[PDB]
Amino acid sequence: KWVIDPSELTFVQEIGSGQFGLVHLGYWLNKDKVAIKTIREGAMSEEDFIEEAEVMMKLSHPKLVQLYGVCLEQAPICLVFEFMEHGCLSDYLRTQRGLFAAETLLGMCLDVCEGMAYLEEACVIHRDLAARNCLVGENQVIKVSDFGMTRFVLDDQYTSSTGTKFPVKWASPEVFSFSRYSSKSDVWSFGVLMWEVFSEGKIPYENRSNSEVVEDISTGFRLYKPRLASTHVYQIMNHCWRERPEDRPAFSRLLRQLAEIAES
């Protein structure tokens, strides 16, 4: 089942402090080494989350971080994930800047695109795909995490398109205008993620306010080609940033296109 009893978990070492609380390296009884995320009370709609657990726990892919279960006996609840030794992709790119071969950066995009094609096939919309949400594991494999989690986030400043903390930098126009989420709006976010990877972790639209990003995108501005991205890779990024969702490629199409470039 998705319920993990407190007696089936041991907390070993604090590894960090996330949005909802602390992250620990620990062990899960008779199973494996895990990452345990403690969720502050009031951060999430726990009842809505728990309700979807039996169905959503079944999602599994080598390029998705597995969320094994929830320890909910007492508050604050804990989420139990597969352990990702090298942490988040955004920090990994920034710390290893200047040491990446262009083929490795393309490979990182392919790992994310593969996990996203699995979600697209399963009709699961991420809603906030970014390098900060991707994790780096054994042999520098990239896996997507936190897909669909903004549906449970109780801070309206992050979830509402007009919210002060709304992740506008990764939002397609129909998302930033109407919260019209789809795999095609995840494709737009994926294009921004490809730019974060090829820029070795630079912040997209670093020089702009949320309203300025909205005004720039609406008038045709697009993120500049990173030095490490080839013109062919940049062409794929721009396809992700087409104004109409219908004109953007599906992740299934992007995966075939990016693989052809990687294996050529």
Ligand SMILES: CCCOc1ccc2cccc(-n3cc(NC(N)=O)c(C(N)=O)n3)c2c1
């Ligand atoms: C506690 C068992 C998992 O329960 C849920 C419940 C609701 C969910 C709603 C959206 C997405 C979920 N979700 C998130 C996951 N992984 C991750 N790294 O974020 C998984 C998975 N199967 O690995 N499922 C959910 C997972």
